[PDB]
Amino acid sequence: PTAREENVYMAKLAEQAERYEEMVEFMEKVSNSLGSEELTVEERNLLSVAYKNVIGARRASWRIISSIEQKEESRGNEEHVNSIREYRSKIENELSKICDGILKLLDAKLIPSAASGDSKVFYLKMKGDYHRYLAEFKTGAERKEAAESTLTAYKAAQDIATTELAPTHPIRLGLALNFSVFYYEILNSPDRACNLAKQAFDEAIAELDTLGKDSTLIMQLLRDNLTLWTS
Template identity: 85%
Template sequence: MVEFMEKVAKTGDSEELTVEERNLLSVAYKNVIGARRASWRIISSIEQKEGSRGNEDHVSIIKEYRSKIETELSKICDGILNLLDSHLVPSATSAESKVFYLKMKGDYHRYLAEFKTGAERKDAAESTLLAYKSAQDIALAELAPTHPIRLGLALNFSVFYYEILNSPDRA
């Protein structure tokens, strides 16, 4: 479904996706990324437990598998982020679409920040913040306070502050 929706997004040239197409694209990527994010969390938890037990043989196998999941996560995130930057954000005309795509951009940078380390994590976090702030500026000016996309943005921005920046006060 991801491949099909990517084709739909790319064939429209400068034409904006319909609400239904936009939602299908989002759901397609959410399904693909969600399973891997869950796998990564589980495997990381197992890695910690095995490490604390001193099972180094298990830990090395688990690290290898975690690395494979991280490669898949990176590839998926890079794919949607490239699509957002090259087609979706530039072709967005309505405030709703702009906020939707910028929120999506922030979400996928946040997913990268969940497992990246060092400079890569810092870059992903900064990109998340930029995308969410851009979306928020438009949302505050042009969307109703009860608009579902604006509310979703507020929620995800809060998750970002809490989980990535470890800032419960700002969340």
């Protein structure tokens, strides 16, 4: 009944109880426990689901408070806008601590332990993902650097994915989705976004057509975003 084994189970209990911050803490220990070896596919995904839910909540709050702010500033009410933005600052604070936690873990333990193509792309995609969440709310040179780190991480992830994983591989397809969402939402470049998404979609269909749920959903998402961006 090892510690690592104990933490993984605890993480799954946290997942069932929807106490994601705690789920993160447990998978954080697991990650910091091993040294030479890599996290299992299950462990790697538990950690990823944990952080996704932790940051997802704050991202949703942010979008809502951000929208209130937009409506109130255009309505002229300034006392309200100050309170809104003060509330947003607090949301942005957690977003920064959260991204910082997983990004540090990626460079210190996860990326260095990646021994296969699945592993490396997954972790590099995750790295791009969290620098992308920072860019969603940053503005000055901060946004610039967050945007830069995002592009660097995704390009690296794609170089490995494009050559080592199948076109229909869910991690590769997810990387394409996120990478293209990055061009569209952050770099406000729907041109580069559609080209990338279309290419990934086409390669997947080609493969599916010649030599055959995750891939199906991702591909539908790519499709939805593809048309949605053609307006």
